[PDB]
Design a binder for this molecule. Sequence first.
Ligand SMILES: Cc1cc2nc3c(=O)[nH]c(=O)nc-3n(C[C@H](O)[C@H](O)[C@H](O)COP(=O)(O)OP(=O)(O)OC[C@H]3O[C@@H](n4cnc5c(N)ncnc54)[C@H](O)[C@@H]3O)c2cc1C
Ligand SMILES: Cc1cc2nc3c(=O)[nH]c(=O)nc-3n(C[C@H](O)[C@H](O)[C@H](O)COP(=O)(O)OP(=O)(O)OC[C@H]3O[C@@H](n4cnc5c(N)ncnc54)[C@H](O)[C@@H]3O)c2cc1C
Lengths: 458, 458
Amino acid sequence: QLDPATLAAFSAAFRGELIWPSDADYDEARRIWNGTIDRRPALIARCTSTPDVVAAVSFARKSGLLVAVRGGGHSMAGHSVCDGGIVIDLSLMNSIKVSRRLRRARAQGGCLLGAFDTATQAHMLATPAGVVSHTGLGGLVLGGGFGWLSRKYGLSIDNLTSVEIVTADGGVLTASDTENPDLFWAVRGGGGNFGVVTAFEFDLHRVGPVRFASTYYSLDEGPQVIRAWRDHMATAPDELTWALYLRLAPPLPELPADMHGKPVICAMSCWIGDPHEGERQLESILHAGKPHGLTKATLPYRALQAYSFPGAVVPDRIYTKSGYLNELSDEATDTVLEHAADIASPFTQLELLYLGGAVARVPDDATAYPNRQSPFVTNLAAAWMDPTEDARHTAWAREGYRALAGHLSGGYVNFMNPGEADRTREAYGAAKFERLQGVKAKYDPTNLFRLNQNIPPS
Amino acid sequence: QLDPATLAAFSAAFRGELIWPSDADYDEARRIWNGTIDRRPALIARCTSTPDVVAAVSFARKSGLLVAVRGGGHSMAGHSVCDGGIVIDLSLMNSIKVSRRLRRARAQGGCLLGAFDTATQAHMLATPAGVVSHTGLGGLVLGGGFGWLSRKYGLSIDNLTSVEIVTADGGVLTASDTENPDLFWAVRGGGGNFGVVTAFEFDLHRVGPVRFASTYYSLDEGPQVIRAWRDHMATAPDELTWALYLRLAPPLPELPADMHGKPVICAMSCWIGDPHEGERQLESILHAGKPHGLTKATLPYRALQAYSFPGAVVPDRIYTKSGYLNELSDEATDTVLEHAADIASPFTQLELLYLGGAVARVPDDATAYPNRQSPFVTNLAAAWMDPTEDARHTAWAREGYRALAGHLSGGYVNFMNPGEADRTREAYGAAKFERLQGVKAKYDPTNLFRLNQNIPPS
Ligand SMILES: Cc1cc2nc3c(=O)[nH]c(=O)nc-3n(C[C@H](O)[C@H](O)[C@H](O)COP(=O)(O)OP(=O)(O)OC[C@H]3O[C@@H](n4cnc5c(N)ncnc54)[C@H](O)[C@@H]3O)c2cc1C
Ligand SMILES: Cc1cc2nc3c(=O)[nH]c(=O)nc-3n(C[C@H](O)[C@H](O)[C@H](O)COP(=O)(O)OP(=O)(O)OC[C@H]3O[C@@H](n4cnc5c(N)ncnc54)[C@H](O)[C@@H]3O)c2cc1C
């Protein structure tokens, strides 16, 4: 229960919608993508402008409310909703200005990935983002952000030119390489720790149709497939991106009915470049084993962005255990294959991704993002429906992570699960963490923004 | 030049951006998708809320500025920009609230399709719209709106449940089957004639993966393909959509270099339903001639929405000629095939679409959309780059339209070119045209919204 004059003051400054536990659209506004997170915020504040976030940030500050900030609500830690505090919901701020002469896009802090790519591709432009269209932009970009364009153009933070950000004291700041450049260093990898970002500006690149391929390998050929992949990507051009999603086979018509719901290697690849070059390049790598249900297409980039994932089903409940690898040993290959063979839910994926390329040529200390030079990412992403099966699906992800343990180092802040608050120092490393603390003490000394992979101040 | 006091009164109420002919955002804010129209407005008002629209409408009224409304800027007639007046520019009003429980979407008047179907596909939901993702939702819906889901679920207006609309006197209204139902009839097919729809509400349907195929046929086999298409669609189930676009083959690696830049039939089809049923159904319609550059895939609906068109090139300049057909005789099939062989630009398409289905089971008088009972639509959509070549490409579409004339009737308002103001009555028919003037006399008696397929009051 809140001081009547202070809410009266907040709401006086707010143009958006307030949702209270007793209102209609409360239960749905407070659900987030990770259905295992069931929290009841004291107030959801769906902001509609930079001034509204200013109002919300200050209200929460002297009311003492715990502050959750919501972009697209895809936090695998469930950070975008709180019990008993305030949700600063940016989901209605999803505008995107795109300048065709500038190759520039100014996007609001609540954009969904697909809204951004729709607007940029109106001029055949694009910049790197994640692969699932309904991910929010805010949480992905603030943690680094990678997808199909990353090997050629870098992380999302590698194409960020500025932010407009609301700091914990209510102020509005511009952060670029020429304005508040400590802050601009922290936001490019340091999550929500330093204020609410209400507008990202990106440099955009011209991306026409990309030649794309998706196929399925039996586990029989599991070794030959993954060893071919790790060897090829060691020397592959930036233009080739190639990923492995180990999963139960989706019951799609392009695959024989006999493999349906059997573990497979789903391999997806594309070529950011001339599709004829992609046609030869992709087929050079498509046949490490016998490809089942081969799909080959020249897609607009926006269609590439909307393709993931085969079967297009939205899981209710989630658990992710992820890490980086400097090299994928044949013993690490045998253990990913033995754990894949025991996947139970039809929505679970053991993803093996190769980064590197443009991401690894950016100097390490340029941004807050860690482990640029570790080129493998592995994500044991459990995803199911039935709440009574929670234990066994998280047990699957826990035990795949443990059996890989020492091969793994660091960690992507945006793949952390709710029980991994203590991974923050080891994900960044002592050096980056300790500089991030220096920025935290300066811009958020009270730690008003602590629902995130949080860096305490000092 | 305008009144300092009411300018100041408008500025005071307006929370958006203003763009003057001296502002750095002017040249690009005033360009729309049809490059052929070059118009310099006195003021571009980039609204951010409904009261913002209330202020820009009243200001134009008091000052007598000709009002253009812009949603997505895709007006084939050029209606979203004006010389010397004010643009009410909705492109920043892009937010979409999607309720999973209700299968309901609320979309602001400036949404693009790609943001809309990103928003709904986060819950495996969808409702019909166009086939190109950067088209604005506002103008498309107010004209009816058809796309991949239309034969199964009807027009975009067949799923609209209410609109929030700002009328010429500055008042804000709700129009539905329950509230001002005369107006709710008029906006469903009558364009921007009755005010600025600041919010569209829709019923959504569950649309999982959809089996999809695109392929190309030589004009050698043009006659049998198009006859099989017209014979099959007369009997096809609603779940089968099948469209033909005659064009120059794009230089894509799936096609033999021999066909690049040569006139072909690009056939695209999909099954809204079980993909295993869909594979059998698309496969039964794929071989009326030898299919080349064949792409088959099981896509998330958002990926289907993002696919058109193969090559993904945005044309600078467009001119279109379009009409309906109750029947596609062999004399017309000939005429279509011969004019397609004369296509000179690599972005020009001769579109032959089959509607019908759920579109044609809505009683004619239920909305303002005309010609549900005509299942065929053909659109000669010339699109090029060179401004010194305008006559050539405009000539191609005029003379193709006129070589079909007697087969063509009515005309989709959303496909009219800047010279076709006269076609408003033939497109609606006399009965609908007279009923719409009746509504126009009530809600826009001064014809303040006249930059549309305009319906004069009385
Ligand atoms: C299905 C799925 C696919 C994914 N694919 C990819 C992928 O391809 N690549 C990749 O790199 N990651 C990917 N991710 C991870 C994604 O980057 C993170 O989950 C991200 O944090 C989600 O962003 P969000 O704002 O939508 O989530 P939220 O839960 O709304 O926010 C996450 C965190 O960011 C903070 N935050 C969000 N917006 C702002 C803002 N505007 N200002 C300040 N702080 C903010 C929140 O406070 C919170 O701590 C994926 C996640 C999912 C669930
Ligand atoms: C590449 C392309 C693909 C297309 N594909 C399809 C398709 O598959 N199916 C189909 O049916 N049509 C299709 N169209 C046509 C489309 O429906 C129309 O061009 C439509 O006008 C697009 O709306 P818009 O808001 O983007 O256009 P705008 O230029 O922004 O607006 C067009 C008209 O609508 C009015 N208007 C716009 N928004 C509002 C509003 N909120 N309130 C009141 N009036 C408003 C404007 O004043 C103007 O009169 C396509 C067009 C293009 C260019």
